[PDB]
Amino acid sequence: AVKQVQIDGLVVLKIIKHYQEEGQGTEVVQGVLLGLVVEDRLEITNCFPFPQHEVQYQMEMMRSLRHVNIDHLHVGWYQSTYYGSFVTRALLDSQFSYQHAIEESVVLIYDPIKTAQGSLSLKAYRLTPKLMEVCKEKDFSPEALKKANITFEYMFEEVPIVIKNSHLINVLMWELEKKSAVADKHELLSLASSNHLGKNLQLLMDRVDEMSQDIVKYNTYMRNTSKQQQQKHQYQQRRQQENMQRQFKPPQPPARMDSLLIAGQINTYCQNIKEFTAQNLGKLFMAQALQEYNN
């Protein structure tokens, strides 16, 4: 696997540049990622994004990255999404496409609204091998699902990010910070968000109602099989009594990859809204110290 992901500064500022110009209302917009992986650390130095509609576009740029003596080895692909919801079958299908060429491959899912309200949200996650295991044998089947065991904690493992630069960027960071307009950093401690919290929970509620849809029919699949097992064992006791005196379709379940996909998606709501929870409650409790002298 990959234990560490690390960035150079060029990938992130062009990741903002596809949000800043290109799609503004809500767009899934997407790219490639770049770098070489020196041992136990995935080093990212570049990206180039893809517009909103392919491999011919992807491979033609690979000569271009070689023309200027820049690193040209594809590691993974990034995608912008809405507030907490990136988990789809389509990106995971487009991730195991790139898990197959190189043994290490990544999504850094950039969420532009969680940055604009607060902390930096790039989600650098990687595939667990046991979810690499089920697609290589191509058995999306419940009988091997328990032997090649997948339960939702190893559904997307997380690789931690460490920022790396050269020192001339630190010159240019020192150069810019003096010569600039004074941009105050106040937007972290905002202390009103209830629709950032509201659409976090409302996008969660339709998936639990999607989860409620999945287990209501799971009763009916058992209500299909609990009649049919006894009806065929009635047909066992019907037909076995018949030949002594002389001398059908079983249903499929709901196909169980979507039931694991909803729990891992509700896993994305659970980590973020509770990290959202003390985030606002910290600025609430520092504001207890702000009113504290005023009589």
Partner 1 sequence: TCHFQAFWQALDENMDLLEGITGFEDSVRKFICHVVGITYQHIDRWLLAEMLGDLSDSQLKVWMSKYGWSADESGQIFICSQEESIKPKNIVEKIDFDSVSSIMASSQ
Partner 2 sequence: QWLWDIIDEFIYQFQSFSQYRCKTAKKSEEEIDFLRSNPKIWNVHSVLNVLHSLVDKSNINRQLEVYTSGGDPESVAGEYGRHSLYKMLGYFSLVGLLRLHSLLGDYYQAIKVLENIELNKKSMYSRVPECQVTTYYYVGFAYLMMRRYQDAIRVFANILLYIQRTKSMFQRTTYKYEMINKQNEQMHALLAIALTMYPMRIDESIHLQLREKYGDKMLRMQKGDPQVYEELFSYSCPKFLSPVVPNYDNVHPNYHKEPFLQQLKVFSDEVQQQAQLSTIRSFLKLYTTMPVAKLAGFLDLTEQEFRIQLLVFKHKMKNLVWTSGISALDGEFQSASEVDFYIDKDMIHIADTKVARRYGDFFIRQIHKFEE
Sites of contact with partner 2 (CB under 8 A): 146-147, 149, 151, 153
285 binds partner 1 (CB under 8 A): yes
Q: At what angle do helices 196-245 and 258-288 cross, to 10 degrees?
A: 150
- From the list partner 1, partner 2, none, which binds 151 (C-beta under 5 to 8 Å, kind-based)? partner 2
Shortest approach of partner 2 to residue 274 CB, angstroms? 9
Applying the rule CB under 8 A, the residues between 262 and 281 that interact with partner 1 are 274-275, 277-278, 281
- From the list partner 2, partner 1, none, which binds 137 (C-beta under 5 to 8 Å, kind-based)? none
Shortest approach of partner 2 to residue 158 CB, angstroms? 17
Query: Do the strands 106-110 and 79-80 form a parallel or antiparallel pair, or are they unpaired?
Result: parallel
Residues 6+ apart with CB under 8 A from 155: 128, 131, 260, 263, 264, 267
Shortest approach of partner 2 to residue 1 CB, angstroms? 20
- From the list partner 1, partner 2, none, which binds 102 (C-beta under 5 to 8 Å, kind-based)? none
Closest by Cα among 85, 84, 107 to 32 = 107
- The first and second tokens of residue 207, run together, are 């998936």
Q: At what angle do helices 89-101 and 129-136 cross, to 10 degrees?
A: 90
Taking the C-alpha atoms of residue 156 and residue 238, their distance in angstroms, rounded to an integer, is 51
Closest by Cα among 61, 65, 43 to 124 = 43
- 80 or 121: whose CB is closer to partner 1? 121
Count of residues of this chain found to bind partner 1 when the rule CB under 8 A is applied = 8
- 170 or 277: whose CB is closer to partner 1? 277
**Which residues in this chain contact partner 1 in the complex, by CB under 8 A?**
274-275, 277-278, 281-282, 285, 288
